[PDB]
Amino acid sequence: QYRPENGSYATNMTLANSLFLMDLNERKQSVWMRITGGRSSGKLNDGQNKTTTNQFINQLGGDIYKFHAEQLGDFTLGIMGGYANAKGKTINYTSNKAARNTLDGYSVGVYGTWYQNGENATGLFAETWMQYNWFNASVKGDGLEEEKYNLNGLTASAGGGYNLNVHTWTSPEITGEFWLQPHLQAVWMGVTPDTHQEDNGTVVQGAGKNNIQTKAGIRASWKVKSEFSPYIEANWIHNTHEFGVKMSDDSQLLSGSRNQGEIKTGIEGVITQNLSVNGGVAYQAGGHGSNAISGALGIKYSF
């Protein structure tokens, strides 16, 4: 039998690295704000422990510079920050023993954007960002005193793609655009936990330090004016490591979604000359028992 508490430690590690992630195409049109809600289900090598958590995230940022250049393109440089929080519970199917975990974190960093022919037109694009994360975590086993530690670190990303205007039509009813976007994204997850000793003398260290998440996919976007622009997206997620936990004995337990399938969809609408609002729904699946279902609402205000 393996304690549930592993599930808890291993999960905070996973969240800590994927909690403040920003996907491609999010940062597009001055001052933004995004608010997310999500639930996730996962399991360990145990064949015993399954963990489910719900989380809330808030992010905001702004554009500092916007230097369009004659030689190569339009650039943007901005800054972002966020606060997030999550709660999980791990239950052991064979033992029936249980445990819970919670996590509060903060982030800050800067991002970058590039379009060769400008957005709203066919051509290459790239996005990038980097940030620092401080998280305060706890693990509680049922009936036992609660344990606190910290995870903090760097997260960095780089990605690109190609925007393509396929067709443009007009209804007698009215002006449609249809767009295809093959894209590729890579993220370096460098948030590591403190090495932590429990009330019982058990030391717990992180497994999975420095995972590289790679996303490859295509987005299909349908723009409409009379604006609103709904989208569908499909991605392949690959991970270089799988997040887990290492013991004093130095055994290990891992929670593996080396390969996952992702499907996104949502609608974005213009509400003012300056303001826009959007909604998005994302769903991730890996092995039996791995899921993330996320709903985000974002607001942006051009100057």
Q: CATH number, domain at 75?
A: 2.40.128.130
What separation in angstroms does the CA of 197 have from each of 28, 139, 201, 202? 44, 12, 6, 5
Residue 62: give the domain boundaries. 1-303
How is the chain split among helix, strand and coil, in percent rounded to 5?
A: 5, 70, 30
Question: What DSSP element (H or E) covers 14?
Answer: helix 5-18
Calculate the CA dihedral of residues 83, 289, 232, 20 and round it to 10 degrees: 20
For 159, half-sphere exposure in the C-beta direction (CA atoms, 13 angstrom radius) is 27
Distance between CA atoms of residues 253 and 53, nearest Å: 19
> Is the Cα torsion angle 210, 258, 45, 285 positive or negative in sign?
positive
Question: What DSSP element (H or E) covers 7?
Answer: helix 5-18
Q: How many domains, the chain? A: 1
Distance between CA atoms of residues 201 and 249, nearest Å: 12
Resolution in units of Å: 3.0
DSSP 8-class letter at 228: B
Distance between CA atoms of residues 286 and 263, nearest Å: 12
C-alpha of 67 from chain center: 28
Q: For 244-272, give one letter per residue: b (16+ CB within 10 A) or e.
A: bbbeeeeebbbbbbeebebebbbebeeee
The contacts of residue 142 (CB under 8 Å, 6+ apart) are: 97, 98, 99, 100
Distance between CA atoms of residues 55 and 232, nearest Å: 24
Closest among 134, 151, 131, 133 to 61, alpha carbons compared: 131
Distance between CA atoms of residues 232 and 265, nearest Å: 5
**Number of other residues whose CB lies within 10 A of the CB of residue 173:** 5
Residue 58 is encoded by which pair of tokens?
């808030």
What separation in angstroms does the CA of 223 have from each of 227, 235, 298? 7, 21, 18
281: left (phi over 0), alpha (psi -120 to 50) or beta: beta
**Do 132 and 108 meet the contact criterion of CB atoms below 8 Å apart?**
yes
Residue 25 is encoded by which pair of tokens?
């195409």
